[PDB]
């Protein structure tokens, strides 16, 4: 049967809409099935993706501040494969975005400050409901252009708020940052964003 999707990405387009993306191993398929429903009681929505080349879909008319569960499966001639599951919420009422994604097991929204033309500080809130007690966080930094190597910072500790200063950066260059909690068992969901320092 088809393998489970190896990755499930969420990106908020607005306070009531997001793009769901997934990734299937390079190794047919007929398509995908994307299921979602409110976590506090609601009908099951099932989206059928009849093209295996399509690995993303937009979902609109979502309720703000309501937790949803998303399930993505792949289909082939043999049958359906196991699903990758994800819980997420679009929260909405500090400069920045008025709406933010949140899942209980991921770090809080990323707050960036450009301390200088070649350095910044990043802070994030502790996960609301982590899967296992936290040992620390892994923070990775890399050029969004590609090719260049990534830098991985280990942030030991389980503070309610964690902070990291990143030196050696270049102005006008986009950098992709990833933050994920390290727990006793393994890692949690990672929050990712691209920034650029300018004056």
């Amino acid at each position: 049967v088809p393998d489970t999707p190896t990755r499930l990405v969420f990106s908020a387009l607005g306070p009531t809409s997001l793009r769901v993306s997934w990734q299937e191993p390079r190794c047919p398929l007929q398509g995908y099935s994307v299921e979602y429903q409110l976590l506090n009681g609601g009908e099951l929505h099932r989206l059928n993706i009849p093209n295996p080349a399509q690995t993303s879909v937009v979902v609109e008319d979502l309720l703000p501040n309501h937790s949803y569960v998303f399930r993505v499966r792949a289909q082939s001639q043999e049958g359906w494969g196991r699903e990758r599951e994800g819980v997420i919420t679009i929260e909405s009422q500090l400069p920045g975005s008025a709406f933010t994604l949140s899942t209980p097991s991921a770090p809080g929204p990323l707050v960036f400050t450009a301390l200088s033309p070649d350095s910044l500080q990043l802070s994030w809130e502790r996960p609301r409901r982590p899967n296992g007690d936290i040992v620390g966080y892994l923070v990775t930094c890399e050029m969004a252009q590609g090719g260049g190597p990534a830098t991985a910072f280990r942030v030991d500790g389980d503070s309610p708020e964690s902070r990291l200063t990143v030196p050696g950066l270049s102005e006008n260059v986009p950098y992709k940052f990833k933050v994920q909690a390290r727990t006793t068992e393994g890692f949690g969901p990672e929050r990712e964003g691209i920034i650029t320092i300018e004056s």
């Binding site: 990755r7 969420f10 990106s11 990758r84 599951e85 960036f112 990712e192 920034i195 650029t196």
Partner: peptide, 23 residues
């Protein structure tokens, strides 16, 4: 590819960030 501009001396900015499950 959404990029968030960080301006020096403008203070902290809360960026909109993607969440990823798995790898």
């Amino acid at each position: 590819s959404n990029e968030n501009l960080l301006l020096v001396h403008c203070g902290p900015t809360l960026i909109n960030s993607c969440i990823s499950f798995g790898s």
